[PDB]
Paper text:
To address these questions, we determined the crystal structure of a close prokaryotic SLC7 homologue in complex with bound l-alanine and l-arginine ligands and studied its transport mechanism using in vitro biochemical assays. GkApcT was determined to be proton-coupled, with uptake of l-[3H]-Ala observed in the presence of a membrane potential, negative inside and a pH gradient, alkaline inside. Crystal structures of APC superfamily transporters have revealed a conserved ‘5 + 5 inverted topology’ fold, wherein the first five TM helices are related to the second five helices via a pseudo two-fold symmetry axis running parallel to the plane of the membrane.
Crystals were eventually obtained in the presence of l-Alanine and cholesterol doped monoolein, and diffracted X-ray to 2.86 Å. GkApcT adopts a ligand bound inward occluded state with solvent filled cavities extending towards the bound ligand from either side of the membrane. Clear electron density was observed in the structure for the bound ligand, l-Ala. A conserved aromatic side chain on TM6, Phe231 and threonine, Thr43, on TM1 provide the main steric occlusion that seals the binding site from the extracellular side of the membrane. In contrast, intracellular access is less obstructed, with only a thin occlusion separating the ligand binding site from the solvent filled cytoplasmic tunnel leading to the inside of the cell. This thin gate is constructed principally from hydrophobic side chains on TM8, Met321, and TM6A, Ile234 and Glu115 on TM3. The amino group predominantly interacts with the carbonyl groups of Phe231, Ala232 and Ile234 from TM6 with one interaction to Ile40 from TM1. In contrast, in GkApcT we observe the α-carboxylate group of l-Ala interacting with a well-ordered water molecule, in addition to the backbone amide groups of Thr43 and Gly44. The maps were of sufficient quality to allow us to identify this helix as YneM, which has recently been renamed as MgtS, a single spanning transmembrane protein from Escherichia coli.
Residue numbers in the entry:
A (entry chain A): 3 to 137, 141 to 461
B (entry chain C): 1 to 27
The structure:
């Protein structure tokens, strides 16, 4: 059940995959990788709805609490990327520290999390694409999820997934320079909203600071936690990094700490321009600029959001596909094969099927539910890795660690407590989907999962 | 790297130039 995977074995698979691949990537390229995976739908969309219905102007404290939970968690991931510098996240770490049973549960949870996160990202993207087009407007009933009045499907959200699914299937190799271009488009547009929006900030809009009390700051924090998911993606590039033991921890923590500051500033400027009660909009940042008659800058920020949110979508789908290739190689799920040449067949993952699943949920499920369901799965993964550092310090203490978590028990415990606190802040119905999904996975392990590449 | 740092820095400046410009010409 708790049969651990030796770190030596994880080095061999990473060393076989990254033998051909060229190494250039440094601390800067990995910070871009991190920022690219972090800034997206969370800050561009969730921030509006969360300020209007959960915290109000106090959404800034809701970003601090939520931001602190991720810092303590990211510090744990950095110790893991320093110690096990292989192309892989939480699934690989749990397999080395806890063992097969914990790695399967978390693994199966993240198959859902990356899928559900892609739908939430694509729903957010749609609201910015629709907002930009008007000023145009498509058929009224193909603009959002199925409610009681109007809309049936969110067609732009269905379409963007299919465009991303077509790109990943085209097999076009990644360019670190091209990623520096898009990440700068995203960073510059955020700074532009801050620099232009500061002039129109009415401190009157901040006066009823905590209208929903601290209870509202806490539920708000569980929502806007989503915006911080993405720092784990720095482990992808491990087979292309010269010295990954000290560059990947830098990338993880730096990309996170940068975004936390932008996030605090965006919250203040947003609630400062528009009264909290008017921010429940599909495009809050474009709306705030339109509210104060900066129409040209608003469209320019809508463009940056479209291009910038698209990179979040590509990462999420890739991280899921990579995760399916890892679970099946370990024998915990069956092996699919497809001919790469007319006479040469290799292991395959059906991206058209994994992408179709995402496209459907993106077109029918409201953003809030999708985000809340990603938040539960991610918080439990974060708690697992945090304890993983402690378990790896007790068992296997001799391992080389270029980066070490500052305070040996305290910080990993704090991450467990802060994340644990945010889990208790999510709606009760969010547990129905998450738990039932885990029961399905737990059944899979006893029937199939015990017929894998470590039973021997 | 290096080229990737310069490429990043240059586009921030291009967008911040174009942005500050368009912002000036508004009610
Ligand atoms: C680094 C930051 C703080 C400084 C640069 C900000 C740029 C974007 C500034 C420089 C001058 C600014 C303008 C100065 C004066 C006015 C008139 C007033 O009705 C507020 C908006 C408006 C129209 C400003 C819009 C933003 C603007 C173009
Ligand atoms: C220069 C010649 C251009 C010719 C014009 C036609 C090509 C269209 C290209 C689109 C960009 C998308 C490229 C595909 C990027 C895939 C990234 C990937 O495989 O994974 C994600 C990565 O690891 C983390 O972001
Ligand atoms: C302690 C802070 C240390 C950091 C120092 C950074 C200084 C950056 C430059 C600022 C000048 C521009 C000020 C723009 C401020 C927004 C406008 C404002 O506050 O009021 C409207 C104005 O007074 C009537 O037009
Ligand atoms: C690239 C550089 C971007 C830098 C962006 C700044 C950082 C974010 C700070 C936010 C707090 C804002 C506090 C400023 C309050 C100003 C009040 C003001 O301008 O009031 C005028 C009037 O009341 C209304 O029209
Ligand atoms: C094996 C099964 C054993 C049975 C136990 C399973 C847990 C059921 C939980 C229900 C939440 C009920 C929520 C009711 C609505 C109140 C929401 C609210 O305001 O909550 C504030 C705070 O969270 C204080 O509950
Ligand atoms: C504090 C108030 C806000 C002010 C905001 C300032 C930041 C924006 C920078 C613009 C210049 C960007 C272009 C210059 C940097 C790229 C070129 C470079 O670094 O070097 C040249 C060459 O590439 C070597 O080989
Ligand atoms: C939303 C669906 C509509 C999408 C519409 C997209 C535009 C298609 C037009 C021309 C193809 C360009 C052909 C000219 C480029 C020749 C080089 C080439 O084949 O580049 C591919 C690249 O190297 C590896 O991706
Ligand atoms: C007019 C016809 C022009 C020719 C057709 C070109 C296709 C359309 C353009 C861009 C695709 C944008 C999609 C988003 C690309 C994201 C790339 C990315 O982040 O790739 C991973 C990175 O290289 C490592 O981290
Ligand atoms: C900063 C306010 C947010 C505005 C957006 C800025 C975007 C800048 C982009 C990338 C950062 C490049 C990496 C940061 C370089 C500093 C690295 C560092 O602090 O330390 C290196 C090492 O760990 C020894 O201590
Ligand atoms: C501070 C509160 C948070 C509010 C948000 C920040 C506002 C400050 C604005 C611009 C900083 C400059 C951004 C330009 C990115 C620089 C990229 C880089 O390479 O930085 C390393 C070094 O500074 C190269 O000299
Ligand atoms: C949270 C409760 C909601 C639960 C929502 C359940 C969604 C099920 C929908 C579609 C499945 C079909 C699409 C997935 C097909 C997978 C194909 C694939 O990945 O094949 C490669 C193989 O896995 C290599 O090991
Ligand atoms: C058998 C046990 C299985 C595990 C079952 C776990 C059930 C969820 C737990 C706690 C939150 C209960 C209330 C959930 C709905 C309200 C939203 C919330 O959590 O808090 C609201 C806040 O306190 C005011 O706004
Ligand atoms: Cl006007």
């Amino acid at each position: 059940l708790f049969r651990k995977k030796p770190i030596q074995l994880l080095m061999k698979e990473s060393g076989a995959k990254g033998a051909s691949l060229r190494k250039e990537l440094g601390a800067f390229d990995l910070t871009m990788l991190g920022i690219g995976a972090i800034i997206g739908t969370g800050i561009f969309v969730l921030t509006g709805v969360a300020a209007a219905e959960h915290a109000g102007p106090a959404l800034v404290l809701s970003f601090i609490l939520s931001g602190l939970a991720c810092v303590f968690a990211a510090l744990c991931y950095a110790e893991f990327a320093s110690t096990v510098p292989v192309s892989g996240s939480a699934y690989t770490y749990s397999y080395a520290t806890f063992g097969e049973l914990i790695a399967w549960i978390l693994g199966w949870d993240l198959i859902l999390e990356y899928g559900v996160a892609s739908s939430a990202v694509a729903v957010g993207w749609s609201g910015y694409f629709q907002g930009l087009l008007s000023g145009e407007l498509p058929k009224a009933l193909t603009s959002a999820y199925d409610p009681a009045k109007g809309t049936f499907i969110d067609l732009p959200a269905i379409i963007i997934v299919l465009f991303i699914t077509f790109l990943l299937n085209l097999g076009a190799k990644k360019s670190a320079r091209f990623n520096a271009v898009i990440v700068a488009i995203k960073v510059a547009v955020v700074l532009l909203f801050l620099a232009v929006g500061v002039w129109y900030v009415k401190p009157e809009n901040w006066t009823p600071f905590m209208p929903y009390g601290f209870s509202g700051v806490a539920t708000g924090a569980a929502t806007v936690f989503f915006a911080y998911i993405g720092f784990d993606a720095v482990s992808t590039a491990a087979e292309e990094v010269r010295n990954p033991q000290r560059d990947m921890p830098i990338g993880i923590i730096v990309s996170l700490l940068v975004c936390t500051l932008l996030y605090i500033a965006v919250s203040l400027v947003l609630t400062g321009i528009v009264p909290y009660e008017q921010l429940n909009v599909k495009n809050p940042v474009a709306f705030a600029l339109n509210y104060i008659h900066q129409d040209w800058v608003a469209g320019f920020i809508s463009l940056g959001a479209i291009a910038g949110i698209t990179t979040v979508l590509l990462v999420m789908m890739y991280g899921q596909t990579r995760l399916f290739y890892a679970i099946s190689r370990d024998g915990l799920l069956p092996k699919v094969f497809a001919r790469i040449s007319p006479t040469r067949q290799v292991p395959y993952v059906n991206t058209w099927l994994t992408g179709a699943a995402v496209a459907v949920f993106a077109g029918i499920i409201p953003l809030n539910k999708l985000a809340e369901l990603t938040n539960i799965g991610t918080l439990f993964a974060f708690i697992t890795v945090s304890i993983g550092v402690l378990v790896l310090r007790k068992t296997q203490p001799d391992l080389k660690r270029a980066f070490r978590v500052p305070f040996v028990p305290v910080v990993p415990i704090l991450a467990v407590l802060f994340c644990g606190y945010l889990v208790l802040q999510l709606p009760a119905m969010t547990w129905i989907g998450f738990v039932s999904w885990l029961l399905i996975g737990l059944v899979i392990y006893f029937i199939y999962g015990r017929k894998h590449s470590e039973l021997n | 790297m290096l080229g990737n740092m310069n490429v990043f820095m240059a586009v921030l400046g291009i967008i911040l130039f174009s942005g500050f410009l368009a912002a000036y010409f508004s009610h």
